[PDB]
Structure 1
């Protein structure tokens, strides 16, 4: 759970009003009053006499009998009591046992699989459409294939379409490709799964494709979910590494479609080098949509500072339009440095408020970081 967000970040008594309202509600919530003013528990908890043990179950022989193994490794054919959720018990789960006769006495909160625990990324609440500057064509297109199918399948249900199963995002680095997809996760309710293509390339023979199975398995139990494959080009381009990468690629194409069903999860991929990946990725039957991310133009850039300069204290001499004219020289990620370097720059000026000169001494340092060649 989380609190709502105050509307204006600017220092003002409106924010004071909002924060004191949330304070008032939190004070009404402040438990003390209620803390001041049987058969179900008594019987079954007697049946599960303490202490309890946790065991791994992989069998269901009857609707009241199964094989259960404990941590030491021994296996036991034990009976299931009535109060155990039958649907909850599935092979590989952890099950509570009676300490005397090892009878199955309930399912447990599954808490394991650390790698996918990292993989179910946070809700990405820090990213929002309000934080994206003027990617209008991308938004509507990504709304067509990702957000809308996960929000109102009614159009697809009525009209008879099968909604697109995959989208690939291409553009120069820093254009905001990852930020958009993360914002979609925030915009929708679907859980977010992010993975960078370089990571799934694994040393051992078969784990690489196994992780691909491991991911799309993870997406399925979450039901509405997003799988974000960042910088896909590492595993998709052209052609003992050679064979495994091909094997890994084919695993995607089998989980991006292939046999069986795919449920509801949508797949979003990102890369900088669309002109390099395998035609199978460009395959307009395998991947239905390819979204373009151009370098920000004049109007898009102005929004970017408006997004990024919203938080510092500014002077009246700042001329954002002048910093825009030159070209689409720098992406938004570069412009984040433009704000960040300036914020540091104005800080070095011993002033807590930034001026236009700080942005000029912000723009140049960003530029020298570029390379040299063809003189």
Structure 2
């Protein structure tokens, strides 16, 4: 309790005093510059009238003119002139005209699409780095290809050459792969895009590769950026339709990836992570190196490792009353870290029947049996016996 408070002490005072400051300061910002700034405001105001007719920029010709196509429909041969530059104007941007004579009075707008919402994440994970605990030899591997050449470029010029491009995290289910992508991206504070590979298939034909253009068009502007393609195993035999998604599309989406990630485009400075549960499902040319470099293989966590993973989950819990925690790990052999999170889930479910608020040691032993029974089928030892 008194440890919690020390943290709670700094947090309250400092930000709430800054809030009280910013509130008073809204006024105060105007006061030191009110004759450069209101002078500028005046001159801005005078040329552009009201309203500001928004058009969408098709293209500029570099000579101080442009062709715009408004949404209100008419096309106009505008001038690039006044409070606007040729470098600020790039296709697909939304430009500000003055209504009565279309002169480009500025640009204040580039994005407003529903599409780009999809790619970005407003994320807040409940497990951050150092709740990836154990398998530390191989977290060290994802660091070297994602985290550490962002954090020090020093090391990758001290060795010379390029920093290795991308990675594939692959192996058995439950091995903590998801939590890796979300947690290494916590460390860096890079833009975490996330798209699934069951969302890379589309219910419209030939829109699938257009979507795959969107992922690294987004990546490239918000860079440095970490693009998670989660579950790209779903490319080989999982598809929404056949006469309006079809066979053509599945192959095309993969062709599209090639051009994005090491085509002319090249698109340097996007770290790519691909989680896939089977790398023998994946395309031979997407498991070509030099767009995803080295592969990291994970396996069902080993006997000492599952100590780590049991401590991560039972730190939340009220602990064992008699303690048999060290023997739980021993009984399990060749088993996932997802079995460990389903075991502390299962212990507190048995506890949840009572609608008691404590948890005791004995629930652990029961809960392990319950969830092992669920795994094993009646035709496995039907087929066998």
Q: TM-score range by the shorter chain?
A: 0.7 to 0.9
Residues in 2 aligned to 1:329 and 1:284: alpha-carbon distance in whole angstroms: 30
The DSSP-based 3-state class of the residue aligned with 1:256 is: helix
Compared CA separation, residues 153 and 94, structure 1 to 2 (3 A): same
The two structures have a TM-score, normalised by structure 1, of 0.88
Q: How does 1:290-305 map to 2 (within 5 A)?
A: 290-305=295-310
Measured after TM superposition, the shift of residue 269 of structure 1 is 0.8
* 1:229, distance to aligned residue in structure 2 (A): 1.5
1:124 and 1:183 in contact (8 A); partners too: no
Assess, with a 3 A threshold, how the Cα gap between structure 1 residues 34 and 278 changes in structure 2: closer, same or farther: closer
- Are 1:326 and 2:331 counterparts? yes
Secondary structure at the counterpart of residue 60 of structure 2: coil
Note the 1:145-224 alignment, pairs <5 A.
Answer: 145-224=145-224
Is the contact between residue 123 and residue 191 of structure 1 (CA under 8 Å) also seen in structure 2? Answer: no
* 1:317-375 deviation per Cα after TM superposition (whole angstroms, max 9, x unaligned): 23221211123454223322222232233233343221111222322332232142133
Q: Retained in 1: the 8 A contact 2:259–2:265?
A: no
Query: Which residue pairs with 1:104 in the alignment?
Result: 104
Task: Check whether the contact 2:173–2:277 (CA below 8 A) recurs between aligned residues.
Answer: yes
User: Any idea what SS the aligned residue of 1:97 has?
Assistant: strand
State the SS of the aligned residue for 2:106.
strand
Q: Could you tell which deviates more after superposition, 109-118 or 170-179?
A: 109-118
Equivalent of residue 8 in structure 2, options 6, 13, 19: 19
* TM-score, L = length of structure 2: 0.86
Can you list the C-alpha shifts for 1:137-184, whole angstroms capped at 9, x where unaligned?
Answer: 221111121212222223333433222223111111121111101111
Where do 5+ consecutive residues of structure 1 fail to align? 1-11
In the alignment, what sits opposite 2:350?
345
**Partners in 2 of 1:57 and 1:210 — Cα distance?**
21
Paired residues of 2:80 and 2:86 also in contact (CA < 8 A)? no
Q: Deviations over 1:215-237 (max 9, x none)?
A: 11111111211111222122258
> CA offset at residue 314 of structure 1?
2.4
Q: Which residue, out of 234, 241, 247, partners 1:242?
A: 247
Q: Whole-Å Cα distance in 1 between the matches of residues 335 and 376 of structure 2?
A: 13
Shift, 1:36, TM fit: 8.4
Q: 2 CA distance for matches of 1:260 and 1:112? A: 25
- 3-state DSSP class of the match of 2:150? coil
> How well do the aligned residues superpose, as a CA RMSD in angstroms?
2.4
Q: Give a deviation string over 1:192-235, Cα, whole Å, max 9, x none.
A: 12222222122433222222222111111112111112221222
Contact 1:65 1:78 in 2 (8 A): yes
**Whole-angstrom distance in 2 between the partners of 1:57 and 1:36:** 36
Q: How many residues align?
A: 362
SS at match of 1:145: helix
Residues 2-13 of structure 1: pairs in structure 2 closer than 5 A: 12-13=1-2
- Cα pair 2:300 2:336 within 8 Å, conserved: yes
| Aligned residues of 2:262 and 2:290 also touching (Cα < 8 A) | no
Aligned to 1:316: 321
Q: Distance in 1 between matches of 2:125 and 2:83?
A: 38
Which consecutive aligned stretches of 4+ in structure 1 deviate over 6 angstroms post-superposition?
none
3-state SS in 2 of match to 1:79: strand
